[PDB]
Structure 1
């Protein structure tokens, strides 16, 4: 039994025609205090996977170490560690999902909501969610916390079902993600303006963007 201390808010993501996009702000909240501002909550694993984590940051840092160790262990006695036997997004997810559900079953959970975004070896987009309860699900768009309530509706207007994915470009997808991040800054009381964004494309690979800012905001007051 735990209670989360230093926390991270929404992680948002979606599929597009050639890959997946994922984003998360750089804030480490301490209750109502917006304590830490240089926190990276997107962690790449290899050149084909990005794990976005919300919830308790001490547990996030533990998960970082686990993923880091997983890369090391996979390389051992593995001549094809950078080829056919490289870590897939599906392997990384299932590992985390196993851990999350085992920890909930021991009544000592990792207080997190996690989204694993990546591209498989055959070019297929991978996007799946797992949380402190061990609950897993997949969808064209996935989001945690406030993102689930405010981002998903916006991202679902772009990709509402499976057939919309081939029709969605990386430009359109990134635009929707960046817009969603702005909306979260307007409305989530534990969000920051600064955020990171990652694109995993089956052609251009992993593009990791740091120090992005929410811009072009409106602040008008009605009369009465």
Structure 2
């Protein structure tokens, strides 16, 4: 892709004591037109991974298909495909990272930023980022695009350093995530009020929540804001 057409904004995510949380709104924009509103940008791979994608939606759909194909292929002649020899988040990540860097290097990027979230077989949280340049990093929180600028600073107040992770519960992390989603709705002109959230827990497995709405907003004070300086009424 030489330039993006239909696009998804921020994907955001954080680790907590027993797993990871990831969220992304359900909008596919078309320039400044808020064109499509039921676009799922979180992609579960098996029971242990959720791949969240921002950027060009055509490229996102292409990646979705690559992932389903992995699942299919991995199962061939694999008696333990649902067990010991299932796909690990780390395998899904390494594959995508390989693909993104290859496409960057052929001057034909997949025009996306991607976060891969899950839990490894030994119970370890997995959270790692890759984008259209093939750039990769991990951190206790990750966010793409606009969310990197406003969600990260919010989320880091919860998990600021590695040691904060075991002190953090799903309940607390999920609240942090949702609040960040509300803040993005306030200040990102390409955000939607509707979003999906997924939790991947070493004990409870994958929990995929569709159709969340940003709630509990403050608009009250707006009645008192008049003019832009001197105007009194």
Report the Cα distance in structure 2 between the residues aligned to 1:98 and 1:152, rounded to whole angstroms.
26
Q: Distance in 1 between matches of 2:72 and 2:175?
A: 36
2:67 equivalent in structure 1: 67
User: What is the root-mean-square deviation of aligned Cα atoms in Å?
Assistant: 1.1
- Structure 2 CA distance, aligned partners of 1:28 and 1:223? 31
The Cα shift of 1:27 comes to: 0.1
1:15 partner SS: strand
Partner of 1:2: 2
Measure, in 1, the Cα distance between the counterparts of 2:68 and 2:58: 15
Aligned length: 224
Task: Give 1:219 shift.
Answer: 1.2
> CA 1:121–1:223 in structure 2 vs 1: closer, same or farther (change >3 Å)?
closer
CA distance in 2, matches of 1:111, 1:68: 19
State TM-score, norm by structure 1.
0.98
List per-residue Cα deviations over 1:104-131 (Å, max 9, x = no partner): 0000000000000000000000000000
Gaps of 5+ in 2: 225-233
Partners of 2:222 and 2:15 in 1: how far apart?
A: 38
Q: Which runs of 4+ in 1 moved over 3 A?
A: 220-224
Q: Distance in 2 between matches of 1:12 and 1:222?
A: 28
- SS of alignment partner, residue 134 of structure 1: coil
The structural deviation recorded for 1:186 is 0.2
SS in 2 for 1:122: coil
Distance 2:143 2:222 in 1: 32
- What's the CA shift for 1:221? 4.1
- Equivalent-residue separation in structure 2 for 1:221 and 1:73 (angstroms): 56
| Alignment-derived partner of residue 47 in structure 2 | 47
CA apart distance, 1:223: 8.8
Give 1:222 deviation, angstroms: 6.8
Q: TM-score, normalised by structure 2?
A: 0.95
Tell me how far apart the structure 2 counterparts of residues 87 and 25 of structure 1 sit (CA, whole Å). Answer: 26
Query: Any idea what the Cα deviations from partners look like across 1:115-152, whole Å, max 9, x if unmatched?
Result: 00000000000000000000000000000011000000
- Match in the other structure for 1:126: 126
Partner-residue secondary structure (3-state), 1:109: coil
Q: Give the match's secondary structure for 2:61.
A: helix
SS at structure 1 position matched to 2:21:
strand
Please give the alpha-carbon distance, in whole angstroms, between the structure 1 residues aligned to 2:169 and 2:156: 14
Q: CA deviation at 1:220?
A: 3.8
User: Is the partner of 1:55 in helix, strand or coil?
Assistant: strand
Q: Which runs of 5+ in 1 are unaligned?
A: none
Partners of 1:43 and 1:217 lie apart in 2 by 28
Distance 1:223 1:212, change over 3 A: closer
